[PDB]
A paper describes a structure:
In oxygenic photosynthesis, carried out by plants, algae and cyanobacteria, transformation of light into chemical energy takes place in Photosystem I and Photosystem II (PSII). The latter harbors the water-oxidizing complex (WOC), which is responsible for oxygen evolution. In the last decade, X-ray crystal structures of the dimeric PSII core complexes (dPSIIcc) from the thermophilic cyanobacteria Thermosynechococcus elongatus (T. elongatus) and Thermosynechococcus vulcanus (T. vulcanus) showed that each monomer contains at least 20 protein subunits including nearly 100 cofactors and an inorganic metal-cluster, designated as the Mn4CaO5-cluster, which catalyzes the oxidation of two molecules of water yielding molecular oxygen, four protons and four 'energized' electrons. In cyanobacteria, three membrane-extrinsic subunits are located at the lumenal side of the thylakoid membrane: PsbO (33 kDa), PsbV (cyt c-550) and PsbU (12 kDa).
For the first time, we obtained a crystal structure of PSII fully depleted of the Mn4CaO5-cluster, at 2.55 Å resolution. The complete depletion of the Mn4CaO5-cluster was achieved by employing a mixture of NH2OH as a reducing agent of the Mn-ions and ethylenediaminetetraacetic acid (EDTA), a chelator for Mn2+ as well as Ca2+ ions. Cluster-coordinating protein side chains nevertheless are found in positions very similar to the native structure. Removal of the Mn4CaO5-cluster did not result in any discernible movement of subunits or domains, neither at the PSII donor side nor in the region of the membrane spanning helices or at the acceptor side, as illustrated by an overlay of the Cα atoms in D1. While PsbU of both monomers is well resolved, the electron density map of PsbU in the unlocked monomer (which is not stabilized by a crystal contact) is noticeably perturbed in the present structure and apparently more mobile, as judged by atomic B-factors. The increased disorder follows through the entire subunit in the one monomer and is translated into the WOC binding site by an interaction of the C-terminal loop of PsbU at Tyr103 which stacks against Pro340 in the C-terminal loop of D1. At the WOC binding site, all cluster-ligating side chains, with the exception of Asp170 (located at the opposite side of the WOC site), are more disordered in the unlocked monomer than in the locked monomer even though the cluster is absent in both. In each monomer, two peaks in the electron density map were observed in the absence of the WOC and these have been tentatively assigned as water molecules. They are approximately located at the positions of the two oxygen atoms (O2 and O3) that bridge between Mn2 and Mn3 in the intact complex.
Residue numbers in the entry:
A (entry chain A): 12 to 344
B (entry chain E): 3 to 83
C (entry chain F): 13 to 45
D (entry chain I): 1 to 33
E (entry chain D): 13 to 352
F (entry chain C): 27 to 473
G (entry chain V): 1 to 137
Write the structure that this text describes.
């Protein structure tokens, strides 16, 4: 059958890159988002992100370098409305209002969601256990948080994270002004997740490199002591555990490789999950702890803490973000 | 293997331990309490009491201005209370 | 088994003040301005 | 514009139909054991 | 000999190894940790900063800090017996003496810990790459807590030891140094986040390429630390990532060294850039952009928006974050957009 | 013990997979916990309820559900008698004891397996007939429950209707919408802005009608699954095991949880703002209204007032031309609410109605909703992050929206977890790779 | 610094008589002010109309004078515009409009003296911060 040949090739394990059914969506959507991103980063004209007819330049050809360049998010006048090309009277209007942003982020989110599914899929075709895709769900959820979830709760794709280095920082700063995310325990767990992951990654790598079993001379790389697919382990887990158990105390060390590797997966993934959830729940304006004026003296004078110093800085971001867009005294959008 | 001390399991399980420590853990805990309830923690460390941050008509913060007569500057602040 | 060891000292320099500090922090909840 | 809208709708339909019909064409059986 | 007798006792196999490095490590670490705990519970910041900062004053775990000494102390070591406290424990606390106490005993503790990793590595029989990797934490601590304030006017502008105090430090560095724009911090982000990534992805790969060595559905039991065979399949994990991502590890030794390299390299890059910020040698601007924007009021990028935010931070937080400056900004000089 | 089943203590409920009596026990025991919380939470809310305060200034999420169903409230949402709240809690609480008693009995006392005790309650996961039959029964239960809502709306007091003329009130629903072009038209609208998918349902008729429809759809499908076995294409497209079915429902419970989030965030019909506080878009629109009324009273001509950007300060147009509120609230112009629709003409906000027809109760409503926007800190300080302590408030909408996004996200993770494992258990490598038959070692090399 | 009898002494009427509130009395007004008022009046500003604050200076130039206990009680009974020309109970909570403003129903005469007492006392404690807005946060 001809459809069975197609299905046999879509699902082949002999392809240099695995395609698969998730890939039948992934490949076109990612290619579309990638091509449009490259073109808009170089060439897009200014975009009126805040919907106040004050366009924001973001591309290289319009006076940006790699650091200041962005694909600018679509207009605040658009809000959450869907805005493909065909909804616009002309390419010129589409570029002015932020069209490439929606095109890119929606194709990308679709493409990365299917990337996750592709990971389950090839793993199933290979006889593997299936949960690598669960780990990749932590950055995917984070991407979902800042491109889709946070716009939904706020009410405009214009509050999505710009596709750009400086645009990203403009997102972090305005976010802290509005939601106090440093004082939110879900971002703190994210910090604990990436710092801890960095630490543990550093740790595991130094401990295994430390226990490598002598197989080479000095005039060559220790790496040539491992050959792709040997059945013998290349380091000495017992020596590494002997070392690290003495560094702290023995029961604070791992003697089970599977138990240690599970810990390596779980610590950053969980912490990133929570920090995705922190962006996703601050989207609905459940904000970080507010301790402003929390400590008071017996007369009633405010006794500042460091929280009140954080507030003075938050205030200064607040009254300067979107400096022309507010006509009324409360920041409700 | 095992290094040689008595396992912590057998210790918090043994009756002798909790004979000793049902007195000691509460004692220190009560000790800590009294350190704050007597007001000693305020004077040992110099931390102001809720009525010792300002004088009754002052909103200026007693900031140390001089490096070397600083010890005396803090005490000139406490006197104005 | 011996009773006092290097570990013994180590657990008690952390633990004795911990319980003491928790006591002091306990009473602080009842301070009214 | 409308020609583009129809062009993309056809493209999207095509791939979505590859996906549903591909995953119905006996996926569980495609494994090594 | 007595030295060989003391060496015998220091290097005894106990529950908590001591070693020669212990004579430095334990008292300094214990005093750094004890000093932080002591101050966050009892010690104010009313005379150094105008801040409350202890459990005893009303602060919670997120707002307690051992705060930095007032700007007027300069870079004084602030020793207890030194000239500022003159042996008065009460006044030393009120002057910020716990800050240097912690930072200095902490600095020496970190030396002791790195010596500890050396000492244990030599006794046990392994290469000393764990201590090498710990250079990055030390480089970070030295640059941020010692060099950076030594570059500035005083220990005051070092980070105060506290959760929210650290957050303020982060925000000071955005408003004043535009630290996000510095490529040395960017390289640190990429080594921290790239380390998290390698940690997560290598753990998942091993757990999802295991061989079947037991019959239990919880697969942990199927490992014995004395076993000789690899517990997961490098061949299968290679094919998977080759076909998913394009490239895959094929050398287990290079893979684990790479896990050392990345986050160690990145912390060292962020230290370098902090060393630059000690001197206010910032990546604050791009000159080309400022020349365009000064001549063209319709030019607006995300770079120029961030600078408006930095200017708002500085004017709105400086009167209380830098109280030794006696700053008084009348309302009309404060930068602010419409309405807010 | 783990040596008997394979699963460890932290995965101990996986030992229940082929023990239908104990598995029934845990399930019935869990359902008691839900019903317990529902009753317990209600009485807590009632013990703390104050009638003079609005419900949303008091941290209530259940009493709002009960009042929307028409029990306890009078005109405009005012609570007139609290005894129906009391009943709902007591009855749930009393029922949970029943559900608990049976759940515990089946768990540790009843027969561990049902398959030898009775051929009707017993089930084998791989038996596609018995599974569709159990599915069918439960579909029938779901249909009945959806009709109970119809019956409460049509035959038993009605529902609270924020849109009712003269101001919202309890109202009996006489003409549910049955027109499939409306009911299934919701299922075909876009999820994006100004459309809303099913979240845009803005009248009780459409609500009551859709439930008549799924009420009938469910009972029919229930009968259909009791009478049929799965076709051949479904047989080869699915995984037939207990974990597999658990994963299918995790995905579904996830999809539903996301949908619930959007519903309570945007919709003010089945979530009456009278009870739940204004929505996000609403409070922002209410802010613009409040300042329009105030400035106009001072003598401003809100149609021709130009704002700093050049756009109108009080009034601008939408991208399709509609007269909308100006300022940054321009993003919220899809908002619809009973306090604002009187000022809506066919072209949008009617400048003449703004000038002459604003009523005091509208100015009161706009001010109330502006100063109760769903914005607050984790410790329930009300406002933007830069707000000083004073107002103890977080909108129920925030609390309900954030929790159910967390639950939804984790259940999607749950779906990915159990789905992949189900697939690997069925294929026979969920425990790792056979050394003596490694699949990759028999495929050819990529290069 | 203490909440002294000197601090808790505010004008009673407009003819110079005074009233000395207790600490308990002041704490009552602060709790009642947060229950009924803070939604619009947090910190002495006015969210729904920033042009009119709760500062003692502003209340003094109001008509009738609102910088003593009498007029604030009167205002909470029958509020008017800044020149006393329009009665505004229809849009401002009061005892007269407790039917449409329910949080004013359960307020006794003692509760109105406390709330007024808190409005006059707080600027004495916090100075320019009362009514100053986010510049003084
Ligand atoms: C198999 C599944 C595979 C799916 C493949 C992709 C299919 C399409 C996917 C679309 C993705 C969501 C985009 C829409 C986002 C959104 O704006 O959704 C919002 C809508 C609501 O729309 C809003 O609805 C509102 C309705 O209110 C209106 O009507 C009300 C009636 O009272 C009021 O009157 C109100 O004032 C009035 O304005 C208005 O229309 C708004 O303008 C409009 O934006 O909710 C809804 O559609 C319902 C919920 C939609 C999903 C929620 C997002 C889920 C994403 C989680 C992803 C995590 C991934 C993790 C991986 C690890
Ligand atoms: C590991 C688990 C850690 C558990 C937390 C430990 C501390 C809990 C103490 C606490 O919470 O104590 C707080 C309260 C009880 O304290 C009371 O807290 C109240 C909370 O405000 C609520 O009530 C107020 C006044 O009535 C307002 O109405 C306000 O809007 C409303 O939100 C008031 O402030 C009271 O003054 C105060 O006494 O406990 C409660 O509420 C009970 C809360 C139980 C859990 C609720 C689940 C909600 C899930 C949300 C998850 C979404 C994502 C969140 C990101 C994280
Ligand atoms: C994606 C976000 C992101 C990421 C990944 C990073 C990553 C990093 N930032 Mg940056 N940063 C960000 C955003 C981010 N930042 C933003 C938006 C800003 C605002 C502009 C800042 C502002 C900022 C500042 C101000 C600083 C950093 C620094 C750093 C580095 C800190 C590394 C570290 O572990 O220090 C942690 C500290 C150490 C490892 C020192 C050693 C500590 C010892 C080992 C601890 C031992 C404890 C002991 C056992 C007892 C503890 C007990 C107690 C808990 C009870 C790292 C490269 C720092 C830097 O560059 O330093 C060189 C720095 O000072 N960032
Ligand atoms: C909602 C939670 C929930 C529920 C309903 C169940 C239910 C069950 N679990 Mg699971 N389990 C859970 C959570 C839950 N588990 C969690 C969180 C963990 C991790 C710690 C485990 C770990 C776990 C393991 C490791 C095992 C089970 C097993 C079981 C089954 C037998 C338990 C047993 O032998 O108890 C014996 C215990 C007792 C007899 C003590 C008394 C327990 C009862 C229920 C107390 C009830 C109190 C209540 C107030 C009484 C109400 C009275 C009424 C009149 C109102 C049972 C069906 C077992 C199994 O599968 O066996 C084949 C098994 O091996 N569970
Ligand atoms: C969806 C559920 C839900 C929601 C939306 C609310 C919402 C609300 N509740 Mg209620 N409540 C709930 C469940 C819920 N509750 C449950 C399950 C209980 C039983 C314990 C209660 C018991 C309860 C009481 C007793 C009270 C409330 C009250 C409140 C209000 C204040 C909440 C607050 O301050 O929390 C504080 C915030 C937290 C405690 C943060 C918790 C964060 C969680 C732990 C994160 C969990 C993440 C994830 C699930 C963990 C697993 C991760 C892993 C898989 C990797 C608010 C209106 C109060 C009120 O005002 O009543 C009038 C009140 O007094 N609730
Ligand atoms: C989903 C719930 C459920 C299920 C599937 C079962 C299934 C079973 N139970 Mg169990 N049981 C349950 C709940 C359940 N029970 C509850 C809640 C209790 C506590 C009241 C008990 C108490 C109990 C006892 C004491 C015994 C069983 C036994 C049995 C077995 C024989 C039942 C029989 O022949 O009934 C035949 C049918 C009937 C008797 C008519 C039932 C009419 C129902 C109750 C009308 C109401 C229906 C309505 C939809 C309920 C709404 C509930 C609400 C929460 C929404 C069977 C395996 C027996 C057993 O296994 O002995 C070895 C046994 O001794 N059950
Ligand atoms: C809880 C509800 C439920 C469940 C779990 C099942 C489960 C099952 N049904 Mg039953 N069924 C139900 C309710 C349910 N049914 C009801 C209420 C009815 C009456 C209308 C039916 C009518 C019905 C029929 C007529 C058939 C089944 C069959 C089946 C089996 C295959 C399902 C399948 O392939 O779906 C997968 C779904 C598809 C392949 C559809 C194509 C893809 C769609 C378009 C995806 C759209 C999703 C997207 C996100 C949009 C969602 C929102 C909105 C726009 C729609 C399976 C055992 C089949 C069987 O074998 O019966 C013997 C069968 O022929 N069911
Ligand atoms: C049971 C609770 C689950 C909590 C969420 C899941 C935690 C682990 C998820 C990490 C996925 C990583 C990517 C693949 C990782 C991967 O491949 O895992 C592999 C590893 C081993 O798998 P096995 O096949 O042996 O076991 C899984 C099943 O087959 C059961 O046998 O899985 C586990 O051990 C799961 C442990 C469950 C118990 C988890 C409890 C830990 C969380 C405790 C709560 C923390 C809260 C913190 C609050 C601040
Ligand atoms: C300073 C100084 C010194 C020192 C002293 C010391 C050394 C001290 C120590 C102290 C200490 C040593 C203290 C301790 C403390 C502790 C604490 C205070 C704790 C607490 C805890 C808690 C609270 C817990 C919590 C938690 C966690 C974390 C986990 C889970 C969750 C929970 C929540 C449970 C000297 C005199 C020599 C000299 C001079 C200076
Ligand atoms: C299986 C199992 C389990 C579980 C269990 C469960 C989950 C159970 C449940 C249980 C339940 C679920 C129970 C319930 C109960 C209830 C009750 C017991 C109630 C009672 C009530 C009453 C008596 C009422 C009273 C009243 C009235 C009448 C009115 C108002 C007031 C009052 C409240 C007084 C666990 C996990 C442990 C583990 C082991 C195994
Ligand atoms: C009540 C109500 C209503 C209505 C509702 C309705 C009428 C609904 C319907 C609904 C529906 C009617 C739904 C359905 C859905 C569906 C789904 C959700 C699907 C799923 C699917 C799947 C899951 C599949 C999968 C797959 C593929 C894709 C391929 C091959 C393989 C498999 C089979 C796995 C309204 C809105 C009016 C108003 C309100 C109330
Ligand atoms: Cl901005
Ligand atoms: Cl605005
Ligand atoms: Fe490894």
């Amino acid at each position: 059958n001809l459809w069975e040949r197609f299905c046999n090739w879509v699902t082949s394990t002999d392809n240099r890159l695995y395609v698969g059914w998730f890939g039948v969506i992934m490949i076109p959507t990612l290619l579309a988002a990638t091509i449009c991103f490259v073109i808009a980063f170089i060439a897009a004209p200014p975009v009126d992100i805040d919907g106040i007819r004050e366009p924001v330049s973001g591309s290289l050809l319009y006076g940006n370098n790699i650091i200041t360049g962005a694909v600018v998010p679509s207009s605040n006048a658009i809000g959450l409305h869907f805005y493909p090309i065909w909804e616009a009277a002309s390419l010129d209007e589409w570029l002015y209002n932020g069209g490439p942003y929606q095109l890119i982020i929606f194709h990308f989110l679709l493409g990365a969601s299917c990337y996750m599914g592709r990971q389950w899929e090839l793993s199933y075709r290979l006889g593997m256990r299936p949960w690598i895709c669960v780990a990749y769900s932590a950055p995917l959820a984070s991407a979902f948080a800042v491109f889709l979830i946070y716009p939904i709760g706020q009410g405009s794709f214009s509050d999505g994270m710009p596709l750009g280095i400086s645009g990203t920082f403009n997102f972090m700063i305005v976010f802290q002004a509005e939601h106090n995310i440093l004082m939110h325990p879900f971002h703190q767990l994210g910090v604990a997740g990436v710092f801890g992951g960095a630490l543990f990654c550093a740790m595991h790598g130094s401990l295994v490199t430390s226990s490598l079993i002598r197989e080479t001379t000095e005039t060559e790389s220790a790496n040539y002591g491992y050959k792709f697919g040997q059945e013998e382990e290349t380091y000495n887990i017992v020596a590494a555990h002997g070392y690290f158990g003495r560094l702290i105390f023995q029961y604070a060390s791992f003697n089970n490789s599977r138990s240690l590797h599970f810990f390596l997966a779980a610590w950053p993934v969980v912490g990133v999950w929570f920090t995705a959830l922190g962006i996703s729940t601050m989207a609905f304006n459940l904000n970080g702890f507010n301790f402003n004026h929390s400590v008071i003296d017996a007369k009633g004078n405010v006794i500042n803490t460091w929280a009140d110093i954080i507030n003075r800085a938050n205030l200064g971001m607040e009254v300067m973000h979107e400096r022309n867009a507010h006509n009324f005294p409360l920041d409700l959008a | 293997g095992t290094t040689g001390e008595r396992p912590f399991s057998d210790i918090i399980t043994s009756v002798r331990y909790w004979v000793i420590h049902s007195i000691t853990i509460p004692a220190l805990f009560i000790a800590g309490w009294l350190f704050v309830s007597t007001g000693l923690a305020y004077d040992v460390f110099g931390t102001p009491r809720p009525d010792s941050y300002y004088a009754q008509e002052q909103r200026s913060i007693p900031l140390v201005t001089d490096r070397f007569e600083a010890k005396q500057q803090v005490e000139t602040f406490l006197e104005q209370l | 088994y011996p009773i006092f060891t290097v570990r013994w000292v180590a657990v008690h320099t952390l633990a004795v003040p911990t319980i003491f500090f928790l006591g002091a922090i306990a009473a602080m909840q009842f301070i009214q301005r | 514009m409308e020609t583009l809208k129809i062009t993309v709708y056809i493209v999207v339909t095509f791939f979505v139909l590859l996906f549903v019909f591909g995953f119905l064409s006996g996926d569980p059986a495609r494994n090594p054991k | 000999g007595w030295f060989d007798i003391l060496d015998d006792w220091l290097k005894r196999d106990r529950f908590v190894f001591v070693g020669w490095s212990g004579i430095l490590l334990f008292p300094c670490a214990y005093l750094a940790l004890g000093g932080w705990l002591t101050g966050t519970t009892f010690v104010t910041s009313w005379y150094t900063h105008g801040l409350a900062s202890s459990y005893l004053e009303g602060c919670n775990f997120l707002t307690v800090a051992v705060s930095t000494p007032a700007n007027s102390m300069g870079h004084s070591l602030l020793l207890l017996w030194g000239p500022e406290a003159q042996g008065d424990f009460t006044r030393w606390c009120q002057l910020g003496g716990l800050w240097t106490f912690i930072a200095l005993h902490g600095a020496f503790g970190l030396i002791g810990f790195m010596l500890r990793q050396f000492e244990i590595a030599r006794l046990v029989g392994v290469r000393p790459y764990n201590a090498i990797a710990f250079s990055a934490p030390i480089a970070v601590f030295v640059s941020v807590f010692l060099i950076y304030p030594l570059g500035q006017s005083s220990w005051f502008f070092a980070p105060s030891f506290g959760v929210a105090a650290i957050f303020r430090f982060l925000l000071f560095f955005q408003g004043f140094h535009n630290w996000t724009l510095n490529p040395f911090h960017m390289m640190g982000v990429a080594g921290v986040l790239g380390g998290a990534l390698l940690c997560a992805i290598h753990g998942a790969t091993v757990e999802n390429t295991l061989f079947q060595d037991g019959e239990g559905a919880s697969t942990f039991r199927a490992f014995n630390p004395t076993q000789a065979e690899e517990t997961y399949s490098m061949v299968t994990a290679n094919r998977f990532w080759s076909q998913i991502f394009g490239i895959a590890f094929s050398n287990k030794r290079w893979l684990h060294f790479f896990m050392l390299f990345v986050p160690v390299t990145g912390l060292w890059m962020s230290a370098i850039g902090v060393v630059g910020l000690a001197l206010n040698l910032r990546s604050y601007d791009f000159i080309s952009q400022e020349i365009r924007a000064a001549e063209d009021p319709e030019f607006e990028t995300f770079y120029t928006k961030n600078l408006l935010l930095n200017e708002g931070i500085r004017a709105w937080m400086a009167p209380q974050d830098q109280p030794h400056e006696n700053f008084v900004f009348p309302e009309e000089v404060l930068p602010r957009g419409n309405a807010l | 013990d783990q040596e008997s089943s394979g699963f460890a203590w932290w995965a101990g409920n996986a030992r229940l997979i082929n023990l239908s009596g104990k598995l029934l026990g845990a399930h019935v025991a869990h359902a008691g916990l839900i019903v317990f919380w529902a009753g317990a939470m209600t009485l807590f809310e009632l013990a703390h309820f104050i009638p003079e305060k609005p419900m949303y200034e008091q941290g209530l999420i259940l009493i709002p559900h009960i009042a929307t169903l028409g029990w306890g409230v009078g005109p405009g949402g005012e609570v007139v008698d609290t005894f129906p709240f009391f009943v709902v809690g007591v009855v749930h609480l009393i029922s949970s004891a029943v559900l608990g008693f049976g759940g515990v009995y089946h768990a540790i006392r009843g027969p561990e397996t049902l398959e030898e005790y009775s051929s009707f309650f017993g089930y084998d996961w791989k038996d596609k007939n018995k599974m569709t039959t159990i599915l069918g029964f439960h579909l029938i239960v779901l249909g009945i429950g959806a009709l109970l809502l119809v019956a409460k709306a049509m035959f038993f007091g009605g529902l609270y209707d924020t849109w009712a003329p003269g101001g919202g009130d309890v109202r009996v629903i006489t003409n549910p919408t049955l027109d499939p072009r409306v009911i299934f038209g919701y299922l075909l609208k876009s999820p994006f802005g100004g459309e809303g998918w099913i979240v845009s349902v803005n009248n009780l008729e459409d609500v009551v009608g859709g439930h008549i429809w799924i009420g009938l759809i469910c009972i029919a499908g229930g009968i259909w699954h009791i009478l049929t076995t799965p076709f051949g294409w479904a047989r080869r497209a699915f995984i037939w095991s207990g974990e597999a079915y658990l994963s299918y429902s995790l995905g579904a419970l996830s999809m539903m949880g996301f949908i619930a989030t959007c519903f309570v965030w945007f919709n003010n019909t089945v979530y009456p703002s009278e009870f739940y506080g204004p929505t996000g878009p609403e409070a922002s629109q209410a802010q613009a209204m409040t300042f329009l009324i105030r400035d106009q009273k001072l003598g401003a001509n809100v149609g021709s007032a130009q704002g700093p950007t050049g756009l109108g300060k009080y009034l601008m147009r939408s991208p399709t031309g509609e007269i909308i509120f100006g300022g940054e609230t321009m993003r919220f112009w899809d908002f619809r609410g009973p306090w604002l629709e009187p000022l809506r003409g066919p072209n949008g906000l009617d400048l003449n109605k703004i000038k002459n027809d604003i009523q005091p109760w509208q100015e009161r409503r706009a001010a109330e909703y502006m100063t109760h926007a769903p914005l607050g800190s984790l410790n329930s300080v009300g406002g933007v992050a830069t707000e000083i302590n004073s107002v103890n408030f977080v909108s129920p909408r925030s609390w309900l929206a954030t929790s159910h996004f967390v639950l939804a996200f984790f259940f999607l993770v749950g779906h990915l977890w159990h789905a992949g494992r189900a697939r690997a258990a069925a294929a026979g490598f969920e425990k790792g790779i056979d050394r003596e038959s490694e699949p990759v070692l028999s495929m050819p090399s990529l290069d | 610094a203490e909440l002294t009898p000197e601090v808790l002494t505010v004008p009673l009427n407009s003819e110079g008589k005074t009233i000395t509130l207790t600490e308990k009395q002041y704490l009552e007004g602060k709790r009642l002010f947060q229950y009924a008022c803070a939604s619009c009046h947090v910190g002495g500003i006015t969210k729904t109309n920033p042009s009119l604050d709760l500062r003692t200076e502003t209340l003094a130039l109001a008509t009738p004078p609102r910088d003593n206990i009498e007029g604030l009680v009167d205002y909470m009974k029958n509020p008017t515009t800044y020149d006393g020309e329009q009665e505004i109970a229809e849009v401002h909570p009061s005892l007269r409009s407790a039917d449409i403003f329910p949080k004013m129903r359960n307020l006794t005469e003692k509760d109105l003296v406390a709330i007024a007492g808190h409005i006059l006392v707080e600027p004495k404690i916090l100075g320019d911060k009362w009514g100053g807005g986010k510049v003084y946060y």
